[PDB]
Amino acid sequence: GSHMEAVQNRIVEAAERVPGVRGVIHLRARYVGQDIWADMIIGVDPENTREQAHEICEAVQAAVCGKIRRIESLHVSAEAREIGDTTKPSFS
Amino acid sequence: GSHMEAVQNRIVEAAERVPGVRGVIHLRARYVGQDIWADMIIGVDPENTREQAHEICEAVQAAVCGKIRRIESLHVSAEAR
16 A cells, blocks of 8 residues: 555544544554554644543544554544644654 | 563552552553553542543553653553442
8 A cells, every 4th residue: 555554544534533633643553463553643722621632532542443443552642733733644 | 570570560550659540450561563552441539520530541641651661652541430
């Protein structure tokens, strides 16, 4: 595809469909054999309270883990973006 | 004992000292290249709101990450118990 890339993009689209998500900021995905362990940073509206931001992260974790075959583990955290800015997901 | 056994005890000791934590229910840690990735479940008092339970989880993450350099990613969730 490359393959990790096709899977990275599927993780991103699954997250980006969760209500409250304003973009995937960063995805780090590591291949343990066939399995994937991931750590994702999502953007959320700066209007959100901390409580609200936490629930968006929990919903992303459930949604991505439910949809993406061989996600062994996923951690999601949140950053308050934007007033505008701006950016396409990055990957490592 | 082994490196991973020693790492798992430090994680559990670090977590159990965070205010709000009522025991470590479950811990999985694994090596991935040069790094350690882990996932953990803490016990929290049932009286805690969900908001409160999330803030305990975050505090564990910061504490354990701060104390154990080689951990690249740690996920913490909570069960009321």
